[PDB]
Amino acid sequence: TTIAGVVYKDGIVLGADTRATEGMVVADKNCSKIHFISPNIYCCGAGTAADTDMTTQLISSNLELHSLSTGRLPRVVTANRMLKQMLFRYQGYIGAALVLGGVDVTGPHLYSIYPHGSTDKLPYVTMGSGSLAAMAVFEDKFRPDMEEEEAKNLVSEAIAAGIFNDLGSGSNIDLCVISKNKLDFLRPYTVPNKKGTRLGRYRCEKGTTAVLTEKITPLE
Template sequence: MPLKPGELDLGTTIIAAEFKDGVVMGADTRATMGSYISTRNANKITQLHEKIHLCRSGSSSDTQAISDIVKYYLQLYSIVNEEPTTLTAAELMRELNYNNKEVLSAAFIVAGWDKHSGGNVYILPLGGTLHKAPFAITGSGSTYIYGYCDSLYRKNMEKEEALNFLKNALALAMSRDGSSGGSIRMAVITEEGVERLYIHNKDIPEYNDLEN
């Protein structure tokens, strides 16, 4: 059904976390229009620069437009400066998001690796504020997993631990939130580069059978 005036469509679950060697990012693949599932295989993880990505939540058109603008500015920046940092990308995103907060329905997680500070995660909720955190979650499914993430996240996790943490958190959110679903896409960003992973719906663990 169509959204009511003033109602926001933020149906998704996105998450990112720092680990020992960089950051991991993850998102479900369901895209909705009100109560209608428009696709079960959306890609909500977008590359902004070589080792900087973001997860998108909110209006697809809004988040894609902002992502394209920031990607363009980062390309220009890297021509006349050194490679941009994750914070540079997050600040650009914050500027655009805040200055257009009255017309945008968009929330982001920006994460990446750079030589100055290693792996970093930044969250930009609705309204355009910017917060650095060891892990970040947002979207409609995030309300179901704050306690899980707070209790199980720990600093300096190994890569496999971090991937398992994200997979289980997303599986829990997808099992409870009607707007999150489909499969899981993940990205691992380290000094060596970016590794993309895809977990098919049939391979996602049930909420009562999670791997430790």
């Protein structure tokens, strides 16, 4: 798991990989880790994959309820305040590491939320298992107020450092760019690793397996 975010001169770029590893065996090769919250706020998830799903749907249900009542656009500080108040109540039994980012009226805002309830606003954050590898790319090559082509090149470079150096990571790199007027969610941004082609033909035919009892039931 390797998730990261950055704040460029106009908006916010988020990135992630696509792998869910159960034990030491790769369970999913295309698990989407960037979630919907509002039409301007997304979040990346790390840690327990069941706790991050049921948390990111609860808050996104309440902000749809809140914004439809007020009739205006949600704010990023509201999603920060809802998350860290409920994670503190469960005393850290819910393992949920989140990168929260969005562009409200006040501008772009990037947060990182730890599963005990501690938050912090930062210009760039990394979470996950291979987050230390992705931090070193940000720590060497960050500059304030970049363009979005420089930002997208920076984040995909940092996620790739978590691919080729962490065991529990590494597949197609997701990205999403949030700006004041544009939302570019795009899952296959790059394919760094393929699967090799088969060589030996293993093909069986009908009748190579012994059957004790067969039943046929029609439908309509």
